[PDB]
Design a binder for this molecule. Structure first.
Ligand code: MTN
Ligand code: MTN
Lengths: 65, 66
């Protein structure tokens, strides 16, 4: 019930997974897992992802009732 | 570290803790713990809070860059 646009946005910005993972200090596998909807990040990791992609968080992770 | 403004925004909007809790389907203790900086709201809960408070999530929850 959270939609995410992480892969689309990352790719539009021409950032690789390995590049984003290093900024975030997480495994590339964890970025990939999020992109593929296998699990969601904690709030802090989500905020760091938004910070390093320079997009509002709700552009990347969307919830709606 | 995340700094949050939930108390301030909630009270400016005249929403009580139990009111917010009901709307979000969580306990009042959960809302209070976020506001007393005990408790870490999940990404989903944070998104629900931003949705109903109708503020950008980063107005409510701010990561301190590090
Ligand atoms: S930062 C917002 C943003 C950038 C871009 C990748 C061009 N987008 O499609 C959105 C609007 C998400
Ligand atoms: S929605 C943004 C917002 C509303 C109000 C509660 C009046 N605020 O102080 C901010 C700017 C957080």
């Amino acid at each position: 019930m959270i939609i995410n646009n992480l892969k689309l946005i990352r790719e539009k910005k021409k950032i690789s997974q390995s590049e984003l993972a290093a900024l975030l200090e997480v495994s590339r596998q964890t970025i990939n897992g999020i992109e593929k909807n296998k699990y969601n990040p904690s709030l802090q990791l989500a905020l760091k992802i938004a910070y390093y992609l320079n997009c509002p968080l709700e552009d990347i992770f969307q919830w709606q009732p």
